Design an enzyme around this catalytic site. Structure first.
Site, PDB file in Angstrom:
ATOM      1  N   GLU A 239       1.014  -1.290   0.223  1.00 35.43           N
ATOM      2  CA  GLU A 239       0.057  -0.004   0.031  1.00 35.43           C
ATOM      3  C   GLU A 239       1.118   1.069  -0.075  1.00 35.43           C
ATOM      4  OE1 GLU A 239      -1.810  -1.125   3.481  1.00 35.43           O
ATOM      5  OE2 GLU A 239      -3.205  -2.297   2.699  1.00 35.43           O
TER       6      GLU A 239
ATOM      7  N   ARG B 224      -3.041  20.075  14.156  1.00 38.31           N
ATOM      8  CA  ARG B 224      -3.021  18.952  13.086  1.00 38.31           C
ATOM      9  C   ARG B 224      -4.175  17.792  13.103  1.00 38.31           C
ATOM     10  NH1 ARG B 224       0.216  20.598   8.731  1.00 38.31           N
ATOM     11  NH2 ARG B 224       2.390  20.839   9.358  1.00 38.31           N
TER      12      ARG B 224
ATOM     13  N   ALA C 188       7.705  24.253   8.071  1.00 38.80           N
ATOM     14  CA  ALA C 188       7.786  23.332   7.091  1.00 38.80           C
ATOM     15  C   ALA C 188       6.614  23.793   6.023  1.00 38.80           C
ATOM     16  CB  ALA C 188       7.707  22.130   7.756  1.00 38.80           C
TER      17      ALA C 188
ATOM     18  N   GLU D 144       8.072  29.411   2.712  1.00 38.06           N
ATOM     19  CA  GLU D 144       7.575  29.012   3.779  1.00 38.06           C
ATOM     20  C   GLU D 144       8.257  29.679   5.199  1.00 38.06           C
ATOM     21  OE1 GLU D 144       5.489  26.693   3.517  1.00 38.06           O
ATOM     22  OE2 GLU D 144       5.046  27.109   5.540  1.00 38.06           O
TER      23      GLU D 144
ATOM     24  N   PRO E 238       9.791   5.788   4.462  1.00 38.41           N
ATOM     25  CA  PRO E 238       9.915   5.085   3.057  1.00 38.41           C
ATOM     26  C   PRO E 238       9.095   3.583   3.126  1.00 38.41           C
ATOM     27  CG  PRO E 238      11.680   4.846   4.588  1.00 38.41           C
ATOM     28  CD  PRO E 238      10.888   5.823   5.095  1.00 38.41           C
TER      29      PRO E 238
ATOM     30  N   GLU F 286       7.029  10.575   0.257  1.00 42.71           N
ATOM     31  CA  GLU F 286       7.396  12.153   0.900  1.00 42.71           C
ATOM     32  C   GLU F 286       8.696  12.149   1.397  1.00 42.71           C
ATOM     33  OE1 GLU F 286       5.413  13.236   4.534  1.00 42.71           O
ATOM     34  OE2 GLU F 286       5.510  15.402   3.552  1.00 42.71           O
TER      35      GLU F 286
ATOM     36  N   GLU G 142      -1.828  37.032   9.261  1.00 43.58           N
ATOM     37  CA  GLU G 142      -2.950  37.770  10.189  1.00 43.58           C
ATOM     38  C   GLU G 142      -3.962  36.599  10.572  1.00 43.58           C
ATOM     39  OE1 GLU G 142      -3.302  40.432  12.310  1.00 43.58           O
ATOM     40  OE2 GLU G 142      -2.343  41.475  10.494  1.00 43.58           O
TER      41      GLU G 142
HETATM   42  N1  APR Z   1       3.502  -0.495   2.018  1.00 43.53           N
HETATM   43  C1  APR Z   1       3.299  -1.659   2.554  1.00 43.53           C
HETATM   44  N2  APR Z   1       1.724  -2.323   2.478  1.00 43.53           N
HETATM   45  C2  APR Z   1       1.498  -3.389   3.032  1.00 43.53           C
HETATM   46  N3  APR Z   1       2.398  -4.227   3.704  1.00 43.53           N
HETATM   47  C3  APR Z   1       3.694  -3.522   3.862  1.00 43.53           C
HETATM   48  C4  APR Z   1       4.338  -2.499   3.400  1.00 43.53           C
HETATM   49  N4  APR Z   1       5.632  -2.102   3.977  1.00 43.53           N
HETATM   50  C5  APR Z   1       5.779  -3.198   4.724  1.00 43.53           C
HETATM   51  N5  APR Z   1       4.615  -4.281   4.823  1.00 43.53           N
HETATM   52  C6  APR Z   1       4.495  -5.524   5.576  1.00 43.53           C
HETATM   53  O1  APR Z   1       4.312  -5.555   6.853  1.00 43.53           O
HETATM   54  C7  APR Z   1       5.108  -6.366   7.200  1.00 43.53           C
HETATM   55  C8  APR Z   1       6.327  -5.510   8.303  1.00 43.53           C
HETATM   56  O2  APR Z   1       6.078  -4.297   8.846  1.00 43.53           O
HETATM   57  P1  APR Z   1       7.464  -3.863   9.721  1.00 43.53           P
HETATM   58  O3  APR Z   1       8.496  -5.013   9.427  1.00 43.53           O
HETATM   59  O4  APR Z   1       7.575  -4.299  10.984  1.00 43.53           O
HETATM   60  O5  APR Z   1       8.492  -2.898   9.031  1.00 43.53           O
HETATM   61  P2  APR Z   1       8.859  -1.702   8.360  1.00 43.53           P
HETATM   62  O6  APR Z   1       8.297  -1.759   6.950  1.00 43.53           O
HETATM   63  O7  APR Z   1      10.216  -2.275   8.204  1.00 43.53           O
HETATM   64  O8  APR Z   1       9.125  -0.239   9.239  1.00 43.53           O
HETATM   65  C9  APR Z   1       8.307   0.600  10.028  1.00 43.53           C
HETATM   66  C10 APR Z   1       8.623   1.869   9.975  1.00 43.53           C
HETATM   67  O9  APR Z   1      10.261   2.138   9.246  1.00 43.53           O
HETATM   68  C11 APR Z   1       9.836   2.884   7.794  1.00 43.53           C
HETATM   69  O10 APR Z   1      10.049   4.245   7.936  1.00 43.53           O
HETATM   70  C12 APR Z   1       8.354   2.479   7.634  1.00 43.53           C
HETATM   71  O11 APR Z   1       7.662   3.550   6.886  1.00 43.53           O
HETATM   72  C13 APR Z   1       7.638   2.518   9.024  1.00 43.53           C
HETATM   73  O12 APR Z   1       7.400   3.860   9.695  1.00 43.53           O
HETATM   74  C14 APR Z   1       5.760  -7.047   6.586  1.00 43.53           C
HETATM   75  O13 APR Z   1       5.934  -8.505   6.301  1.00 43.53           O
HETATM   76  C15 APR Z   1       5.633  -6.472   5.332  1.00 43.53           C
HETATM   77  O14 APR Z   1       5.206  -7.794   4.615  1.00 43.53           O
HETATM   78  N1  APR Z   2      -4.023  16.220   5.297  1.00 46.52           N
HETATM   79  C1  APR Z   2      -4.318  17.332   4.457  1.00 46.52           C
HETATM   80  N2  APR Z   2      -5.230  17.155   3.178  1.00 46.52           N
HETATM   81  C2  APR Z   2      -5.466  18.262   2.536  1.00 46.52           C
HETATM   82  N3  APR Z   2      -5.003  19.436   2.565  1.00 46.52           N
HETATM   83  C3  APR Z   2      -4.113  19.444   3.405  1.00 46.52           C
HETATM   84  C4  APR Z   2      -3.807  18.682   4.555  1.00 46.52           C
HETATM   85  N4  APR Z   2      -2.724  19.126   5.547  1.00 46.52           N
HETATM   86  C5  APR Z   2      -2.488  20.416   4.914  1.00 46.52           C
HETATM   87  N5  APR Z   2      -3.529  20.514   4.085  1.00 46.52           N
HETATM   88  C6  APR Z   2      -3.684  21.830   2.822  1.00 46.52           C
HETATM   89  O1  APR Z   2      -2.442  21.836   1.849  1.00 46.52           O
HETATM   90  C7  APR Z   2      -2.051  23.510   2.174  1.00 46.52           C
HETATM   91  C8  APR Z   2      -0.688  23.530   2.918  1.00 46.52           C
HETATM   92  O2  APR Z   2       0.398  22.631   2.562  1.00 46.52           O
HETATM   93  P1  APR Z   2       1.579  23.283   3.567  1.00 46.52           P
HETATM   94  O3  APR Z   2       1.289  24.239   4.307  1.00 46.52           O
HETATM   95  O4  APR Z   2       2.603  23.779   2.803  1.00 46.52           O
HETATM   96  O5  APR Z   2       2.081  22.566   4.704  1.00 46.52           O
HETATM   97  P2  APR Z   2       2.321  21.424   6.000  1.00 46.52           P
HETATM   98  O6  APR Z   2       1.024  20.920   5.956  1.00 46.52           O
HETATM   99  O7  APR Z   2       2.456  22.672   6.939  1.00 46.52           O
HETATM  100  O8  APR Z   2       3.694  20.809   6.103  1.00 46.52           O
HETATM  101  C9  APR Z   2       4.389  19.852   5.263  1.00 46.52           C
HETATM  102  C10 APR Z   2       5.228  18.859   5.962  1.00 46.52           C
HETATM  103  O9  APR Z   2       5.192  19.156   7.572  1.00 46.52           O
HETATM  104  C11 APR Z   2       4.204  18.195   8.112  1.00 46.52           C
HETATM  105  O10 APR Z   2       5.176  17.127   8.512  1.00 46.52           O
HETATM  106  C12 APR Z   2       3.542  17.632   7.150  1.00 46.52           C
HETATM  107  O11 APR Z   2       2.953  16.462   7.493  1.00 46.52           O
HETATM  108  C13 APR Z   2       4.286  17.629   5.668  1.00 46.52           C
HETATM  109  O12 APR Z   2       5.330  16.620   5.743  1.00 46.52           O
HETATM  110  C14 APR Z   2      -2.843  24.221   3.022  1.00 46.52           C
HETATM  111  O13 APR Z   2      -3.501  25.329   2.377  1.00 46.52           O
HETATM  112  C15 APR Z   2      -3.743  23.139   3.610  1.00 46.52           C
HETATM  113  O14 APR Z   2      -5.089  23.610   3.446  1.00 46.52           O
END
Ligand code: APR
Ligand code: APR
Lengths: 157, 157
Positions: free
Chosen positions: B19, B44, B56, B72, B93, B98, B115
Site C-alpha cells: 500500500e 494537526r 515546514a 515557507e 519510506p 514523501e 494575520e
Molecule cells: N507499504 C506496505 N503495504 C503493506 N504491507 C507492507 C508495507 N511495507 C511493509 N509491509 C508488510 O508489513 C510487515 C512488516 O512491517 P515492519 O516490518 O515491522 O516494518 P517496516 O516496514 O520495516 O518499518 C516500520 C517503519 O520504518 C519505515 O520508515 C516505515 O515507513 C515504518 O514507519 C512485513 O511482512 C511486510 O510484509
Molecule cells: N491532510 C491534508 N489534506 C488536504 N490538504 C491539507 C492537509 N494538510 C494540509 N493541507 C492543505 O495543504 C496546504 C498547505 O500545505 P503546506 O502548508 O505547505 O503545509 P504543511 O501541512 O504545513 O507541512 C508539510 C510537511 O510538515 C508536516 O510534517 C506535514 O506532514 C508535511 O510533511 C494548506 O492550505 C492546507 O490547506
C-alpha cells in the site's frame, strides 16, 4: 471522519477537507558499537530504492514500544541489549498519525546466530553515513537521519 | 502500480501487496537566534493535537526546495535569511515517498511585519524543547526533533 480505504498497515480517511492516513505506530533502534552505528537497508517499493535506515518496525498487536524494539532488533540482527527509551516523533503530522518511538541499544549480545536476507545490515560510522549522504551516495529515512544526528549530539562522549 | 485514490496532497496506490501513499515533497527550516530555535505549532487533524515542529511546507508547482524554504519561512514568520541546504530524508519510506529537504536559516531579517494566526510561532531553547518532550509536555514532529538534534550536534559551537 469518513473512510475511503481500510488496509493492512494503513487506512485512508477523509476529515472534511483533510486527507488522513491512519497508520500503526512504529519503533526504531539506535545501536552504536566501537564507533559504528547499526544501519540497515531493504528495497522500499514506496520510493523505489533502499535508503539508509536503522532497525525499525511496526508495533504488533499485544506488544508495547519496548517489546517491539527488542523484537525488531532480534529479527533483523539476531541481537539483544540494554534498551533505553529516548524520544518519539510523528513522521509527518500533516497527513498521517504514524508515531515512531526511538530507543538506544547498549551492550549488544547475540541471541540468534534473517536467512531470507530481506534486510541488509550496514554497520557504518555515523560520520561516514553523513558524508556519503552529503555526496549524494545514499538517501536517509527519518530513522537513519535521527540516528546520525543523535550520535553526533550525545554519543561522542 | 494501481490507483485507489487521487487527491489534493496525496494519492493512495497499490503495488501488488504494498500500500503506497504518493505525496508531494516538503521542506523544513532550522533557524537559531540567540540560543532559541524557531519552532511552530498548528492544530494537526491527522493527530488531533499540535506537535512541536519547525517551519515546514509542501513544494509548490514550479519551485525548487530552496525557493520553497524561503517562501515557507516568509509566510509563517515574515522573515528571510541566508539559507543553506543541510540534508534530506524520506519521512517513512515503508509506505510513502514523501521526501523532506532541510535547510538552515541564518542572519534573519524582517520582510513582512500571518494575520489569520493559523501558525503559532514558538521561539524556544532546543534544550528546553527536549526537556519538555522528555516530561511529556509536548509531542515532536520529525522536523521538530531533527531541528533539536541538529542543534545539539552542530550549533552549540
Ligand atoms: N507499504 C506496505 N503495504 C503493506 N504491507 C507492507 C508495507 N511495507 C511493509 N509491509 C508488510 O508489513 C510487515 C512488516 O512491517 P515492519 O516490518 O515491522 O516494518 P517496516 O516496514 O520495516 O518499518 C516500520 C517503519 O520504518 C519505515 O520508515 C516505515 O515507513 C515504518 O514507519 C512485513 O511482512 C511486510 O510484509
Ligand atoms: N491532510 C491534508 N489534506 C488536504 N490538504 C491539507 C492537509 N494538510 C494540509 N493541507 C492543505 O495543504 C496546504 C498547505 O500545505 P503546506 O502548508 O505547505 O503545509 P504543511 O501541512 O504545513 O507541512 C508539510 C510537511 O510538515 C508536516 O510534517 C506535514 O506532514 C508535511 O510533511 C494548506 O492550505 C492546507 O490547506
Amino acid at each position: 471522519r469518513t473512510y475511503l480505504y481500510r488496509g493492512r498497515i494503513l487506512n485512508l480517511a477523509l476529515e472534511g477537507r483533510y486527507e488522513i492516513v491512519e497508520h500503526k505506530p512504529a519503533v526504531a533502534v539506535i545501536a552504536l558499537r566501537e564507533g559504528r552505528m547499526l544501519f540497515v537497508r531493504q528495497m522500499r517499493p514506496a520510493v523505489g530504492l533502499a535508503p539508509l535506515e536503522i532497525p525499525a518496525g511496526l508495533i504488533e498487536p499485544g506488544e508495547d514500544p519496548l517489546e517491539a524494539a527488542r523484537r525488531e532488533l532480534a529479527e533483523e540482527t539476531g541481537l539483544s541489549g540494554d534498551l533505553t527509551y529516548l524520544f518519539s516523533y510523528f513522521v509527518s503530522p500533516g497527513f498521517t498519525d504514524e508515531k515512531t518511538h526511538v530507543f538506544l541499544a547498549e551492550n549488544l549480545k547475540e541471541v540468534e546466530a534473517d536467512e531470507d536476507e530481506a534486510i541488509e545490515v550496514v554497520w557504518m560510522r555515523p560520520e561516514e553515513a553523513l558524508e556519503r549522504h552529503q555526496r549524494g551516495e545514499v538517501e536517509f529515512s527519518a530513522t537513519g537521519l535521527v540516528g546520525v544526528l543523535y550520535y553526533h549530539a550525545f554519543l561522542r562522549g
